[PDB]
């Protein structure tokens, strides 16, 4: 939503002017964060951990 404003100083009998609540968005665009690791079968067998 738009910021709050100050009401307007006006004459008598004058039109009340429009300054309506105005809207926008922030767009999220979720980015795929990825991580890989590869290990050989002999490595997996021989390692202590």
């Amino acid at each position: 939503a738009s910021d709050e404003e100050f009401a307007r100083p006006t004459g008598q009998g004058a039109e009340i002017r429009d300054d309506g609540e105005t809207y926008t968005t922030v767009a999220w665009n979720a980015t795929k964060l990825t991580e890989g690791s590869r290990v050989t079968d002999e490595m997996r067998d021989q390692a202590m951990v």
Partner: protein, 136 residues
Amino acid sequence: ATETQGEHTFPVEVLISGEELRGYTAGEALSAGEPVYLSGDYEVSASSADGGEFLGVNLYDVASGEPVALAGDDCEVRVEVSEQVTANDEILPDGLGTFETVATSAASAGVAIVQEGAASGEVCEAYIFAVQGTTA
């Protein structure tokens, strides 16, 4: 403008019909029925002669810097004229707080049309149809 009824003076009702009633700030002291133009941002001052300076007529007396109401176009109005006006005369500001005919001014088009004729210094009934500003 004002109306004598014996010993009494009465204010003249500027607005005959219409709803073009819009808020501005007075750039000087303004009186009811006085023609005005934009002198600053939403700020209005008394019109000068020969056109290019008209937004509306001041509805009530105001001091400098106070919020003013104007009748703009599509208002029928009671206004004071500096010369004889007949019906169907086009009028614009005279620069004297009053109106004159297009025919008398150096301008070629008006801002109001006289519905009810008046002598010099008296109240005509007119319809506001245009605004005039800076064209160079």
